[PDB]
Write a protein that binds this ligand. Structure first.
Ligand SMILES: [Mg+2]
Ligand SMILES: [Mg+2]
Ligand SMILES: [Mg+2]
Ligand SMILES: [Mg+2]
Ligand SMILES: [Mg+2]
Ligand SMILES: [Mg+2]
Ligand SMILES: [Mg+2]
Ligand SMILES: [Mg+2]
Ligand SMILES: [Mg+2]
Ligand SMILES: [Mg+2]
Ligand SMILES: [Mg+2]
Ligand SMILES: [Mg+2]
Ligand SMILES: [Mg+2]
Ligand SMILES: [Mg+2]
Ligand SMILES: [Mg+2]
Ligand SMILES: [Mg+2]
Ligand SMILES: [Mg+2]
Ligand SMILES: [Mg+2]
Ligand SMILES: [Mg+2]
Ligand SMILES: [Mg+2]
Ligand SMILES: [Mg+2]
Ligand SMILES: [Mg+2]
Ligand SMILES: [Mg+2]
Ligand SMILES: [Mg+2]
Ligand SMILES: [Mg+2]
Ligand SMILES: [Mg+2]
Ligand SMILES: [Mg+2]
Ligand SMILES: [Mg+2]
Ligand SMILES: [Mg+2]
Ligand SMILES: [Mg+2]
Ligand SMILES: [Mg+2]
Ligand SMILES: [Mg+2]
Ligand SMILES: [Mg+2]
Ligand SMILES: [Mg+2]
Ligand SMILES: [Mg+2]
Ligand SMILES: [Mg+2]
Ligand SMILES: [Mg+2]
Ligand SMILES: [Mg+2]
Ligand SMILES: [Mg+2]
Ligand SMILES: [Zn+2]
Lengths: 192, 136, 176, 23, 126, 37
RNA sequence: UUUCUUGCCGGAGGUAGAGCUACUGGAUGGCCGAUGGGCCCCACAGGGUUACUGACGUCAGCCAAACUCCGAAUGCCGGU
RNA sequence: GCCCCUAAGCGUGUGCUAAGUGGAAAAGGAUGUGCAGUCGCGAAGACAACCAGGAGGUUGGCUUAGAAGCAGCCACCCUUGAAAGAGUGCGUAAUAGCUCACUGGUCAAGUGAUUGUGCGCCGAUAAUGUAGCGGGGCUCAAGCACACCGCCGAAGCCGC
RNA sequence: ACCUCGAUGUCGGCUCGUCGCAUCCUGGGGCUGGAGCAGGUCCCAAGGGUUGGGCUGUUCGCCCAUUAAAGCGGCACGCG
């Protein structure tokens, strides 16, 4: 499992404040902050279209290499802020990472397969925490369900993982649950 | 018909209806859900009507979640009465909702049927609404 | 646009004269005049074809190009060969007959109904149950055909009335 | 009725800037 | 169908033609499923009966010298490969065509040259 | 000829058109005919 | 000039907001659930070998003028 | 505020409006129109249109008088393939037929969807006389949006 | 409770009008679970007409004989 960095251009902010941030967002640049173990916080700007394209292409957790006035830095998108209604990228958090580091990254999980007629699939947990080096973080994790019946509680620890990844979350977590199909009587009874 | 078992205080002011919802603005119980846009006081009977409308069309499979509960009361005084002489009595219960709040959540295999049921539900509410999914 | 792109062929036995925007065609069956839309210009290809061109690519020009092309094609075809339309009758005791330039019907009313023949159109009947209408102008032929058809109200039970050759009318049965 | 709606919508003129006495 | 699928079909017919001795071209229009299945069963003993696309066979014909059959691909075309012997399948298709009256043989290929319908009939008779 | 604020293609054969600023739907079945107003 | 305005400095609050394993209440869906703090033989010993209850726990998503682990701009007193 | 009533611009440049919107309004409905961003397909022949094939166990099981693809429930299996879906319907008590879904042969490049936005349409309806631009009138804007140049305008300020 | 208490006189009935259409008849159409007479529903339309009696002061309402019909409302619940 290997991944390649994505290149983007960033500029040093001239002014800081709510007015400046609003003006930049209106213009079409999303403000962001770069901080890490280097003890040297920096706050920059990115191109909204390019950033959105990169996120769409390579998921939420992507390795980014930045061109800061001719200097190259390796950064990871730690967290994002999204407006609940307009659905924009209000702000971004970037963490400096060098090759050969252990990081805690949350990765989404997907469920695919076929179910028996009396089986209904439910997903209690959508994300898990895994520890791996920067360049081998998976973009998606899949779990297969085929011909299960009755109680088939899928445990988080039971998920198959690649090499070089540690399951930070305890094995006690439950991710996917399978229960008998509902009925009209139960549906009517519930909610009254 | 959802009502609270008991409340510490039985008569209260009008709930505040300003601002944008902060919590519960993301949908994670199933696959599809509803989010509001306007401000209004959703009633218990409206909630019941929406739930019945969804269920009667979904029929066998799936299940529905409700993320709100009409616990805050409202009062009405007897008609044909002058003003004053004290406050009225509680009549119907409402739930405060703000833009971004997620109301209902449904999980079902078929996207077409799910969206049809959600639209049937939306048509019964007093405010505009939009269908949203689990993925970002 | 797509329909109007193809130039309209001109048969040898057709005489075409162009005077600015007015257009006239002389042929064996007669002559007719025409007026073209101002925004669109028409040109005569030297190889015996009609060329219609549009200056722009907006809504009005796009709409008018095909209309003008089809109208010119219809005009040339009509002046060349002509146009005809024939009908047929159904029911019991329904008859048609010809008297000079006029035509008389018998639809079962207390009185007989007459139809007046306008200019440039002639009626022809071969059988008491079937007749035909002939003319040169397609629009006029269609108008008179519609007027003839509208004489009797629709009947979805017994199908009594008049209609075109292969026209199929929806029918339903009243059990009572 | 018609009369009441007319006045309150007449406050949206350019000069009054949106505020008019007695609504 | 995808580009990979079309390429796979081209390669499939290319190798089928390479492994086959000769082939004939016929029209499958106006034939019912029952008689089509009957013909397939009759011809399955020695040869194979399938349907080929005009452009697809045109492209697959570039490898060999059968490019002269390009002019014969106008309209519907059903391709048959004679893996075993030559005359059995030709006579079978001729008898089926004359019995049905709804099938017309466009031509065939053998000896590295295309031949007209009269020559196809003569070789089938031989 | 139904007259309602909302007009929809009831069956898979209806076609929606526009005439003189009024949106009406026509179809082979007479029942399926209505207009806005 | 002790009045008022501006800059600077020292001052105590409990709103808006937000939060809940931080207290009192309302409350959405899951998990084992001993022990219903309890019921097929009542054995003094297998389970809802049976659709319950499931406490306490734990997974997550919420609400309150008479809830506050938190908490501002204006406002007010004093000094220059 | 600057077409006339009336003092001053039937001002300059770039775009939108076909509804007198401008000069009344909601849930909701819709092939009106301009801009920005998408995925699928398209020279290996896209979409529509105009000829052929659209089948065999098969009437799949329960249900019913009845159930054959089309009151209802379970799989929603499979052979032949180019394609057959336990089939979206308007068809008969039940069969039988018109068909259709994907696809073949002829023409030749646009064809669909949601995504966000500027303007618009329907929803529209009370009583003495148009009467919801102040009047005449205006889409050859005298309407709307973004920039630029001027003027008229009080007992406000300046001048004696 | 905003004008009228140094005054805005009142419920029905009689006489006399005028206006709106959310139409009772007369006039023109669409769809029908429209065979025809006769019916149900929607669309356009305000030129004309819309009776006489028994009962209560009535409004309202029941009833007796007719016609095409015996419409709903506004004008200080029209009009001393
Ligand atoms: Mg909260
Ligand atoms: Mg609503
Ligand atoms: Mg007010
Ligand atoms: Mg002092
Ligand atoms: Mg403090
Ligand atoms: Mg306190
Ligand atoms: Mg608050
Ligand atoms: Mg608590
Ligand atoms: Mg939460
Ligand atoms: Mg308060
Ligand atoms: Mg508080
Ligand atoms: Mg205070
Ligand atoms: Mg002047
Ligand atoms: Mg001008
Ligand atoms: Mg411009
Ligand atoms: Mg209008
Ligand atoms: Mg207006
Ligand atoms: Mg409106
Ligand atoms: Mg809508
Ligand atoms: Mg077919
Ligand atoms: Mg089968
Ligand atoms: Mg059934
Ligand atoms: Mg848009
Ligand atoms: Mg004016
Ligand atoms: Mg002064
Ligand atoms: Mg008073
Ligand atoms: Mg008084
Ligand atoms: Mg008095
Ligand atoms: Mg009086
Ligand atoms: Mg009317
Ligand atoms: Mg009438
Ligand atoms: Mg009716
Ligand atoms: Mg009338
Ligand atoms: Mg008159
Ligand atoms: Mg009146
Ligand atoms: Mg008086
Ligand atoms: Mg009076
Ligand atoms: Mg009066
Ligand atoms: Mg009155
Ligand atoms: Zn239809």
């Amino acid at each position: 499992t290997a991944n390649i960095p994505n290149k983007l251009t960033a500029n040093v902010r001239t002014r800081t404040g709510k007015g400046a941030s609003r003006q930049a967002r209106r213009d079409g640049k999303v403000p962001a902050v770069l901080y890490g173990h280097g003890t040297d916080p920096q706050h920059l700007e990115l191109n909204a279209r390019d950033f959105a394209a990169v996120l769409r292409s390579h998921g939420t957790n992507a390795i980014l290499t930045l061109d800061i006035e001719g200097t190259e830095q390796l950064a990871l998108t730690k967290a994002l802020d999204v407006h609940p209604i307009r659905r924009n990228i209000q702000h971004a958090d970037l963490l400096v990472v060098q090759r050969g580091e252990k990081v805690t990254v949350e990765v989404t999980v997907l469920v695919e397969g076929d179910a028996t007629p009396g089986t209904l699939v439910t997903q209690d947990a959508n994300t898990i925490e895994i520890e791996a080096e920067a360049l081998s973080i998976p973009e998606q994790l899949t779990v297969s369900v085929e011909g299960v019946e009755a109680g088939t509680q899928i445990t988080a620890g039971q998920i198959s993982l690649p090499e070089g990844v540690n399951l930070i979350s305890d094995p006690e977590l439950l991710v996917v649950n399978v229960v008998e199909a509902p009925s009209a009587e139960a549906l009517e009874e519930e909610g009254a | 018909m959802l009502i609270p078992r008991k409340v510490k205080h039985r008569k209260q002011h009008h709930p505040e209806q300003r601002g944008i919802a902060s919590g519960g603005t993301s949908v994670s119980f199933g696959d599809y859900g509803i989010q509001a846009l306007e401000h209004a006081y959703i009633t218990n009977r409206q909630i019941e009507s929406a739930r019945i409308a969804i269920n009667r069309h979904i029929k066998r499979g799936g299940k529905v979640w409700i993320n709100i509960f009409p616990d805050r009361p409202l009062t009405k005084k007897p008609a044909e009465t002058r003003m004053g002489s004290g406050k009225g009595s509680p009549e119907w219960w409402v739930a405060n909702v703000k833009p971004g709040r997620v109301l209902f959540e449904l999980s079902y295999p078929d996207e077409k049927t799910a969206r049809d049921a959600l639209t049937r539900a939306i048509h019964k509410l007093p405010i505009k609404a939009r269908i949203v999914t689990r993925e970002e | 646009s797509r329909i109007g792109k193809q130039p309209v062929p001109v048969p040898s036995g057709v005489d075409v004269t162009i005077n600015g925007q007015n257009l006239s065609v002389k042929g064996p069956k007669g002559t007719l005049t025409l007026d073209v839309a101002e925004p669109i210009s028409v040109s005569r290809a030297e190889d015996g074809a009609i060329v219609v061109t549009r200056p722009d690519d907006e809504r009005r020009s796009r709409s008018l190009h095909g209309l003008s092309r089809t109208l010119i094609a219809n005009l040339v075809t009509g002046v060349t060969e002509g146009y005809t339309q024939k009908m047929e009758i159904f029911g019991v005791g329904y008859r048609v007959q010809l008297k000079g330039q006029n035509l008389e019907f018998a639809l079962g009313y207390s009185h007989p109904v007459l139809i007046e023949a306008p200019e440039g159109i002639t009626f022809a009947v071969e059988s008491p149950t079937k007749f035909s209408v002939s003319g040169i102008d397609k629009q006029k032929v269609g108008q008179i055909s519609a007027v003839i058809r509208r004489l009797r109200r629709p009947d979805p039970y017994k199908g009594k009335g008049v209609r075109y050759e292969g026209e199929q009318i929806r029918r339903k049965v009243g059990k009572t | 009725a018609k009369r009441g709606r007319k006045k309150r919508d007449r406050k949206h003129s350019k000069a009054n800037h949106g505020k008019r006495p007695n609504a | 169908m995808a580009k990979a699928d079309k390429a796979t079909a081209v390669a499939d017919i290319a190798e089928q033609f390479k492994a086959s001795t000769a082939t004939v071209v016929t029209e499958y229009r106006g034939l019912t499923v029952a008689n089509l299945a009957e013909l397939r069963r009759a011809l399955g003993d020695s040869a194979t009966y399938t349907v080929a696309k005009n452009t697809l066979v045109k492209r697959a014909a570039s490898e060999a010298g059968i490019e002269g059959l390009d002019e014969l691909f106008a309209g519907p075309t059903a391709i048959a490969f004679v893996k075993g012997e030559a005359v059995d399948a030709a006579k079978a298709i001729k008898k089926f065509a004359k019995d049905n009256k709804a099938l017309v043989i466009k031509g065939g290929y053998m000896d590295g040259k295309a031949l007209s319908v009269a020559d196809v009939e003569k070789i089938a008779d031989l | 000829m139904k007259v309602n604020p909302s007009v929809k293609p009831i069956c898979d054969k209806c076609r929606v058109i526009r005439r003189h600023g009024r949106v009406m739907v026509i179809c082979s079945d007479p029942r399926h005919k209505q207009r806005q107003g």
